Amino acid sequence: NIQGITKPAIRRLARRGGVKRISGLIYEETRGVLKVFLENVIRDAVTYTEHAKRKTVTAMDVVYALKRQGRTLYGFGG
Amino acid sequence: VLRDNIQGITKPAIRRLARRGGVKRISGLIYEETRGVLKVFLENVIRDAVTYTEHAKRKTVTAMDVVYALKRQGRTLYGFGG
Amino acid sequence: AKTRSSRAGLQFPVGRVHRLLRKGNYAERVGAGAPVYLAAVLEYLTAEILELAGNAARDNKKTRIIPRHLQLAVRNDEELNKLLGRVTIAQGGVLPNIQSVLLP
Amino acid sequence: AKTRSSRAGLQFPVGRVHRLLRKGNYAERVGAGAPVYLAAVLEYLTAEILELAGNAARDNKKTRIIPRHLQLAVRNDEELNKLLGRVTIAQGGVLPNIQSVLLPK
Amino acid sequence: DEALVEELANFRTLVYCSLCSKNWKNMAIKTCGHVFCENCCKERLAARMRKCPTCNKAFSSNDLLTVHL
Amino acid sequence: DEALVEELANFRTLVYCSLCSKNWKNMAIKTCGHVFCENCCKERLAARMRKCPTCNKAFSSNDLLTVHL
Amino acid sequence: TRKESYAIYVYKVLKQVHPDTGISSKAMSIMNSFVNDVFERIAGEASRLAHYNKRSTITSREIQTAVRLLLPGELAKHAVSEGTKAVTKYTSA
Amino acid sequence: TRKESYAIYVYKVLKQVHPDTGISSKAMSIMNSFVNDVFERIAGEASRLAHYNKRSTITSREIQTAVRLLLPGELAKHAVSEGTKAVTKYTSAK
Amino acid sequence: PHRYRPGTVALREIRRYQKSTELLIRKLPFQRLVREIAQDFKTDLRFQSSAVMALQEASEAYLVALFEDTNLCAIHAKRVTIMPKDIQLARRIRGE
Amino acid sequence: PHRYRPGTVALREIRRYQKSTELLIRKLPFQRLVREIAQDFKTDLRFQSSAVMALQEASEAYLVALFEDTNLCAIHAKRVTIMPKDIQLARRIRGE
DNA sequence: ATCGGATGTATATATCTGACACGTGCCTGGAGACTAGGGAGTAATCCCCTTGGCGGTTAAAACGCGGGGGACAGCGCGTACGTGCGTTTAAGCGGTGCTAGAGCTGTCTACGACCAATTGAGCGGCCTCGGCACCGGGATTCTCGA
DNA sequence: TCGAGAATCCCGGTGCCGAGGCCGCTCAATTGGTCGTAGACAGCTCTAGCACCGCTTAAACGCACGTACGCGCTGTCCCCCGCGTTTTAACCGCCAAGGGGATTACTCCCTAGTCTCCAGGCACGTGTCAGATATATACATCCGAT
Ligand SMILES: [Zn+2]
Ligand SMILES: [Zn+2]
Ligand SMILES: [Zn+2]
Ligand SMILES: [Zn+2]
């Protein structure tokens, strides 16, 4: 579940971002932020994959769902 | 031609907008900074209205070109015939 | 000779919507049951906002609807505010609020 | 029999663009010289980025462009960075930058 | 004399940027080694012209090195 | 008129190597932007004179760049 | 010449919810623009959504799912039901 | 079945600027998806201009004024200058 | 000599101006500015009254919405006065 | 023995991760998280590998772009440690 | 904390006009009825790809301890900004005049849709070797307690 | 100030699998006519955008004065970074089963297209009353002396 996003994994993203010191309460805040974004993308992906009477959500549905939210993504076709 | 009309935006006029915004105390060096932000927002909008108004072979800006220009930047405006 | 909108039971025009949808370069063909479905959704949203506007006008002892009531009703409701996110209403105004720390 | 692209002195295909414009429900009719104008623009933009990426592909002592080299081409120039302002290139990375307050004295 | 002026004119062409003929040569390109002034070079970089006026070799912004005297 | 004689000498010392005064400034240093002649450069590397004369700093093998004119 | 609008229909709807109020001409234009924007961006999603599936007709099913991708949360659950309840009546008669 | 892409034309363009330089599959797949994104934007903007003025044909003018509306600043000048030079060559050809 | 504490009058103007809906800039000075700006793209141009009014109706909203977010960055730094370094940060975080 | 001053390792690892290019979160737990989140919309679903890869790439990009905006408003308060209030202020200003 | 004086904010009654609501003429766009053909619904099938399970390495995660730098609170000072008053400037409103440009109408010609016949360009399948990945050794640079 | 120690870079050798070229083969772009409607052009009407002047008078402007707040400094203490040891499960390689995604025939009925007819929505005209404006009055609020 949501406990698979471990503290070193969270801190590596912060290091790439460019921070130098991290307070101890950050991880709990960021997990609940990521969980909200994933739901928003997946709901549209599932609606797209359900309109076409399919049973497997494909990569193009994810690409379209990302595209209509103001976030396009190159490198997966289309 | 007409020049240096940027000083028509007076200090009380700028402060009245900040009052509606909600601030309470205003620093001294805010008016010059703010006058440079409104002069940039009015170039992007007008450069598109002028582009619209010359593709139609007209030589007068209408009230629909401004609405289209504002819509093209994700700033749709209701009330003027949009 | 009955109108196409009275059969469905709506107040909005079905034929006008059909010809507007069949002439805006959307698709090569338009199904028969599409305008009936689309003209029933356009009627619900306008009533939804026009009831809140009426209540806001009534709370101010007036008997008309000036643009301020529209802005108040839109900004006071979460779903409507989210739907009408990046849109501005002329002569609208602003929702009254003051930061808590600023008060004495 | 020559091709329209060769007659117009281009590299991109004009007939395919002409067909794509027609079969897309954009307008009822399509002018004659519209594809020959639209295909000359799609090629200049491609040649710009493929020229800006070859310098990055060389400063790292490589001879084959990879997505990381395309990432550094559209982020070091205002003109292209403002056009691709909301695009996430896969396997791109970030741009090296450290705030000046963090460094030691 | 003319020879004294000619050497003055000959050396004048070496100190000033050929494009501008108004400022001392200040900016040099690593790829080709040619030296021009800093002012004339920058406006070219904003005109999307990355080819050397002399040796035609392509260059980029990072290949710009300042020179002294 | 000595008025333009001084300019030529000022022009001459600018382009001539300040060390030998016999060669053009055709070998510049990448580290600090100074320019000298190739004649006065490699003689210093014989004794490992990595310290530049003008600003007095060290250098390397890739800090010397060929320049023209 | 003439020009079309939704004025009469909006007034007819208004006299149903509040039978004793009115509306000003300046707010009428706002109400007329809102219904043109919503209809424009609902029917613009169906044409693109039918192109993905290599279809040629936009039917009621392409709109039932185009409404679900725009209206947030509670609004969609009511709009879909009211749209569906209207087609059944029309088909029967 | 068949599938179409600009992978053959991008490679031809690349060998005119950098004579000896390859390109990997991921880079090709990105450069392929960028052209479609630009093409879908230009034509999509040009259609609304035709609709606004009660016209029915997309001629060369709408493309020119749609390029001048999307590309920022100095790119538009070069794009227009490169398009209007290809069109005149095409029209006066064989 | 009946004066007021420094801020009780400015705290009332907020209530006054958050309840009324009207333009806050002078019409002629604002209209001259548009004509001055729009004479570089193309000379000898003409405007409708509605075009100028619609151009003015949007700048008010833009400036008001910008002054609301720069008041949060000043609160974040334990202040009540807004300095020019807040307008830069608020404008940079939303990308412009 | 031998130790390092607090901060040097942080700077070197910053320099390290801003030069590489692979994914930072482990793959199998993320796949499990996606499969669990998707269960509340429609049961008995199937996923392609490319869909999960695209989801991971988008999530990484979003989180990386947000951690570099919270840092910029952490410095504004003359501070060098990021905080949940900084994250909340950044999200509020961005316009969520 | 407890009164008091002054100031700005609600509260109640004329009056008066310009915009809202309603009525009528008329014309064009929407409703009926019938026809033909192509898009879409349905059945069969086959083969790729997704799910599930098993065993070994080992790389990454978890936990604990020391201590030193950074977050935070309290103080003091002095410059910048809020508040009020008198004087000056230009905006707002009204009225008149003139003409440049928007909007509509009638011609007609050149340009783009449409169809039959050709052929060469671009796509699918296969080979191959060289650029890049990886590992083992020195050489140079960076940090910290003296 | 600079030596000990650890991290990082330049170089050489080995190997492998994906980019780059080649070939055969459909089917889509090219020629060549034909026709009918969209649009370019000339002319006319009339309206609304621009320019100018005179008269209030509201608001922008400059100045004096006081004080609340921004900023710099100092001190205590607690919590996050660095480093070592131990426990976990991620990752790689391998195997097998069957589901459903994609493809191909076949039919049938639903939407485009045309002609006819008439009522509904639009332009224009008119009454009248809801709210803006002014004025006298009641009261909540705030800063000071105590
Ligand atoms: Zn020069
Ligand atoms: Zn050169
Ligand atoms: Zn020398
Ligand atoms: Zn030096």
Domains and their CATH numbers in chain E: 2-66 (3.30.40.10)
Q: Is J43 touching A (CB cutoff 8 A)? A: no
Distance of alpha carbon I38 from alpha carbon I40, whole angstroms: 6
Distance of alpha carbon C83 from alpha carbon C81, whole angstroms: 6
User: Solved how?
Assistant: cryo-EM
Q: Looking at the structure, give the CATH architecture of the domain made up of residues B1-80.
A: Orthogonal Bundle (1.10)
- Helix (H), strand (E) at residue F42: helix F39-46
Task: Kindly report the CATH class assigned to G1-93.
Answer: mainly alpha
Structural domain of I56 = 1-96
Q: Which nucleotide lies nearest residue H4, CA to C1'?
A: K123
Contact between the CB of H24 and strand L at under 7 Å = yes
E strand spans, E1-69: 27-29, 35-36, 64-66
Nearest protein residue to L144's C1' (by CA)? I2
Distance of alpha carbon C34 from alpha carbon G57, whole angstroms: 10
Contact between the CB of I20 and strand L at under 7 Å = no
SS3 for C99? coil
Task: Please check whether the domain covering A1-76 is classified as CATH 2.60.40.420.
Answer: no
- With touching defined as 3 or more inter-chain CB pairs under 8 Å, the answer for chains C and A is no
CATH number at residue J42: 1.10.20.10
Q: Is C103 touching B (CB cutoff 8 A)? A: no
Angle of helix H60-70 versus helix B30-55 axis, rounded to 10 = 170
Q: Which CATH number fits domain C1-104: 3.30.365.10, 1.10.20.10, 1.10.3720.10, 1.10.10.10?
A: 1.10.20.10
Mutation site for C-interface testing, chosen from B17, B20, B23, B24 by largest number of C Cβ within 10 Å? B24
DSSP chain J: -----TTHHHHHHHHHHTS--S--S-HHHHHHHHHHHGGGTSSS-EE-HHHHHHHHHHHHHHHHHHHHHHHHHHHTTT--SB-HHHHHHHHHHHT-
Show Cβ contacts of residue J93 under 8 Å, excluding neighbours closer than 6 positions.
I69, I72, I73, I90, I93, I94, J73
Selection from F48, F26, F51 nearest residue F37 by Cα: F26
Structure tokens at C90: 């002329």
Structure tokens at A44: 């549209």
CB I47 within 8 A of CB B63: no
Resolution in A: 3.2
C 6-65: CB under 8 A from H:
24-25
CB C62 within 8 A of CB G25: no
Round to a whole number and report the distance in Å from the CA of A55 to the C1' of K51.
14
Give start and end residues of each alpha helix (H) in A1-78.
7-17, 26-51, 59-67
Round to a whole number and report the distance in Å from the CA of A21 to the C1' of K77.
34
Distance of alpha carbon D47 from alpha carbon D58, whole angstroms: 17
Chain B residues in contact with chain G using a Cβ-Cβ cutoff of 8 Å: 76, 78-82
How far is the CA of A21 from the CAs of A27, I78, J60, in angstroms?
A: 13, 21, 20
Minimal C-alpha gap between H47 and chain C (Å): 10
Distance of alpha carbon C22 from alpha carbon C8, whole angstroms: 20
Q: Which nucleotide lies nearest residue B10, CA to C1'?
A: L60
Please tell me the number of the ligand nearest to residue E38's CA.
1
Widest pairwise Cα distance in chain I: 57
SS3 for I82? strand
Start-to-end C-alpha separation, chain E: 27
Strand partners of residue A74: D89
Q: Tell me, what amino acid is at E41?
A: C
- The rounded Å distance from CA F49 to ligand 4 centre is 13
How many other C-beta atoms are found inside a 10 Å radius of the C-beta of residue H83? 22
CB B30 within 8 A of CB B11: no
Q: Which residue has the tokens 């001294």?
A: B28
DSSP B21-54: HT-SEE-TTHHHHHHHHHHHHHHHHHHHHHHHHH
Q: Which residue has the tokens 């679900």?
A: G68
Q: Specify the CATH superfamily of domain D1-105.
A: Histone, subunit A (1.10.20.10)
CB H56 within 8 A of CB H64: no
Distance of alpha carbon J55 from alpha carbon J61, whole angstroms: 10
> Taking the CA of residue J17 as centre, how many other CA atoms within 13 Å lie in the half-sphere pointing to its CB?
20
CB D36 within 8 A of CB D14: yes
Give start and end residues of each alpha helix (H) in I1-96.
10-17, 27-37, 49-76, 84-93
How many other C-beta atoms are found inside a 10 Å radius of the C-beta of residue F65? 15
How many other C-beta atoms are found inside a 10 Å radius of the C-beta of residue J46? 12
The domain limits of chain D are 1-105
10 Å CB burial of residue C37 (0-12, 13-18, 19+) is buried
Structure tokens at F68: 């023209």
CB E34 within 8 A of CB F68: yes
Selection from C99, H31, F60, B69 nearest residue D45 by Cα: H31
How many other C-beta atoms are found inside a 10 Å radius of the C-beta of residue B77? 19
Show Cβ contacts of residue C51 under 8 Å, excluding neighbours closer than 6 positions.
G17, G18
Name the DSSP class of E48. T
Round to a whole number and report the distance in Å from the CA of C22 to the C1' of L113.
14
The domain limits of chain A are 1-76
Q: Tell me, what amino acid is at H74?
A: E
- β pairing state of A56-57 and J46-47: parallel
Cα-Cα-Cα-Cα torsion A71, A75, A76, A78, nearest 10 degrees, comes to: 70
Structure tokens at G84: 């569906």
10 Å CB burial of residue D5 (0-12, 13-18, 19+) is buried
Distance of alpha carbon C36 from alpha carbon C17, whole angstroms: 9
| CB within 7 A of strand L (chain J, 38-77) | 46
Round to a whole number and report the distance in Å from the CA of B6 to the C1' of K90.
16
DSSP G19-65: TT----HHHHHHHHHHHHHHHHHHHHHHHHHHHHTT--EE-HHHHHH
